[PDB]
């Protein structure tokens, strides 16, 4: 057997609150910045199918 | 933004109608896998029944009316079913253009309605017809699309997560994507 | 979520038993994979006891 | 001896059928004898003793069936003309102008062969309340409305037109659009604000009524 | 004080043009799932904010199962207003509406 050489530490983050954005006051970017997650263009889109409009909001 | 309204029509956010029902009966696609299993419908009456409850039931929707116009399309269907289709009268409406399906029991789309008739007729089986009817007419009534369905969405996805399996070789036209992007 | 209407639409909306069947055309997509099939093989056989 | 002149008889026999079809459609009183004219007798009657194709006795007068008058009361008279001259003048067309408008029809037919001189176009709108319609009789051949992905238009009086707009509660411009040069809105003769009637065939419901605007 | 007569005057009246009567309310005589959901969203986050609770909460320290407790004894005083494409509206209480 063989162990591989990539592994799974620099893979997970969470936040709770944070640093923002000066322009747009959104949650920063960052792995090490303890920065947010994005909630992109596909994912607004699964949320309409479901019709959760509160989830969306 | 398309969505189903509560007069079952499909409009556009902005009000703009698209369609006057969706898919033409108003079935909502995760409800109807057993819709027309009428042989396991039948063998589990007794369990369909008390799901779709119809006893505290029948006070809040109307019975009669569309059962009544639904026989009087059915008999003049058939009589004028050796017609083309430009010779097809225009009496008759389908009833779902007439009754609300969620409000009037029996007001049913009539390619389900020739699926009940056709199993009730070549089939001879505690149960009637009577009652057999008038579970499967109420199974088609809990089925329907809600009112404020993002169909528009799930549409799109049911067209844009299945192109991602067809993306391959030959196994003369055009397929796949480059055919769909046309 | 952070409130109680997005706590009562993930529970009652988007929850994984409303997904069982998928809108595409109304298939099971949820369902056990690789042991689970070769289990039942062997377990509703008619040599267990 | 029936090379040429049996097909340019047969693609003005077919022609002919469409637009009696085509009459009958919008409510007309055409028989149906007049719609089932076997070919040898189109040319027992509109053919000389020559065996040519004339068009001077195949121009005739529709009238509306009982039907159509308790449904749509300004339903008037319709005159449908043919054409010998294939190149149509300007001429012509100030004839089939007045004709119109002398014996005091609603709808006009011009079927011509060719071409029209758009000189002799600017007349189609000539007259306010009267209404003139061209046809090629090449596009006349086969009647479209009889083809299986064609389903069937019926179009609404203003009382039931307004029976939709009530139940929907819709403006005019909700609705889905039909153009005003559709191939079936001209077939049928769509004003703009006519609202037509679809009976599709839907792959999962059967008989499915939708609706259409004219704009 | 003579605009805002006027202006309140037009609004009210208005707002009784959109009001469609119980007895011409032609929607669906369900609650569809989204009614549902919000119902239990509305009133779970008035509970939380010291509403008073019309049902013994048999040791239940969940806002939402309170909820889930008051709908199946038709205890929520709520009233849906199901808004009709043009802005017209039918108002559907929701101890009244069949639920699923």
Same mark, same amino acid.
């Given at each position: 057997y063989q162990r591989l050489r990539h592994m799974v530490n620099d893979k997970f983050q969470v936040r709770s609150t944070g640093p923002v954005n000066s322009l747009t006051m959104q949650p920063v970017k960052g792995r090490k910045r303890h920065g947010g997650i994005r909630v992109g263009e596909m994912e607004r889109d699964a949320l309409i199918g479901h019709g959760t409009s509160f989830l969306l909001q | 933004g398309v969505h189903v309204s509560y007069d079952n029509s499909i409009r556009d956010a902005d009000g703009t109608l698209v369609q006057f029902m969706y898919g033409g009966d108003a079935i909502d696609i995760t409800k109807e896998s057993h819709m027309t299993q009428f042989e396991?419908? #039948? $063998?589990? @009456? @007794?369990a369909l029944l008390k799901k779709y409850n119809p006893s505290a #039931?029948?006070?809040? #929707? $109307?019975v009669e009316s569309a059962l009544k116009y639904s026989k009087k399309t059915l008999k003049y269907r058939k009589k004028h079913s050796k017609e083309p289709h430009y010779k097809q009268s225009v009496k008759y409406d389908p009833v779902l253009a007439k009754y609300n399906p969620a409000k009037y029991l029996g007001s049913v789309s009539e390619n389900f309605q020739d699926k009940l008739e056709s199993f009730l007729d070549k089939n001879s089986k505690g149960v009637n017809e009577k009652?057999?009817?008038? #579970?499967?007419?109420?199974?088609y009534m809990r089925s329907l699309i809600n009112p404020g369905e993002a169909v528009g969405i799930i549409a799109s996805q049911s067209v844009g997560e299945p192109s991602t399996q067809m993306t391959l070789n030959t196994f003369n036209v055009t397929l796949g994507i480059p055919r769909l992007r046309e | 979520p952070q409130?109680?209407?997005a706590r009562a639409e993930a529970l009652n909306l988007a929850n994984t038993d409303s997904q069982y069947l998928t809108p595409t055309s109304g298939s099971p997509v949820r369902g056990l994979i690789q042991d689970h099939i070769s289990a039942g093989v062997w377990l509703t056989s008619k040599d267990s006891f | 001896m029936d090379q040429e002149n049996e097909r340019n008889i047969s693609r003005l026999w077919r022609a002919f059928r469409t637009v009696k079809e085509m009459v009958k459609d919008r409510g007309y009183f055409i028989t149906q004898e007049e719609v089932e004219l076997p070919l040898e007798d189109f040319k027992a009657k509109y053919c000389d003793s020559m065996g040519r194709p004339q068009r001077k006795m195949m121009s005739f007068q529709a009238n509306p069936t009982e039907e159509s008058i308790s449904k749509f009361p300004d339903?008037?008279?319709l005159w449908v003309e043919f054409c010998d001259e294939p190149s149509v003048g300007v001429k012509?067309?100030?004839?089939?102008?007045i004709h119109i408008q002398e014996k005091n029809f609603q709808t006009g037919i011009f079927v011509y062969q060719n071409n029209i001189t758009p000189s002799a176009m600017k007349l189609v709108p000539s007259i306010p309340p009267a209404t003139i319609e061209t046809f090629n009789e090449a596009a006349l051949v086969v009647n479209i409305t009889h083809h299986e992905l064609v389903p069937k238009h019926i179009r609404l009086?203003?009382? +039931?037109?307004? +029976?939709?707009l009530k139940r929907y509660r819709l403006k005019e411009s909700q609705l889905p659009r039909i153009q005003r040069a559709d191939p079936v809105a001209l077939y049928l003769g769509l004003k703009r604000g006519e609202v037509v009637k679809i009976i599709r065939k839907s792959e999962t419901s059967g008989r499915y009524a939708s609706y259409r605007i004219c704009m | 004080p003579e605009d805002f007569q006027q202006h309140e005057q037009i609004r009210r009246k208005t707002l009784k043009e959109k009001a469609i009567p119980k007895d011409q309310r032609a929607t669906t005589p369900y609650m569809t799932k989204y009614e549902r959901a919000r119902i239990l969203g509305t009133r779970a986050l008035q509970i939380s904010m010291n509403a008073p609770v019309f049902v013994d909460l048999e040791g239940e320290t969940d806002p939402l199962r309170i909820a889930m407790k008051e709908l199946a004894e038709k205890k929520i005083p709520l009233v849906i207003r199901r808004y009709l494409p043009d802005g017209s509206f039918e108002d559907w209480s929701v &101890? &009244?509406?069949?639920?699923?």
């Open positions: - | 396991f419908c #039948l $063998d589990n @009456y @007794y #039931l029948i006070e809040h #929707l $109307d009652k057999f009817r008038a #579970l499967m007419q109420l199974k | 409130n109680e209407n | 339903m008037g008279s012509t067309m100030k004839t089939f102008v009086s203003s009382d +039931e037109k307004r +029976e939709l | &101890e &009244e509406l069949i639920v699923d």
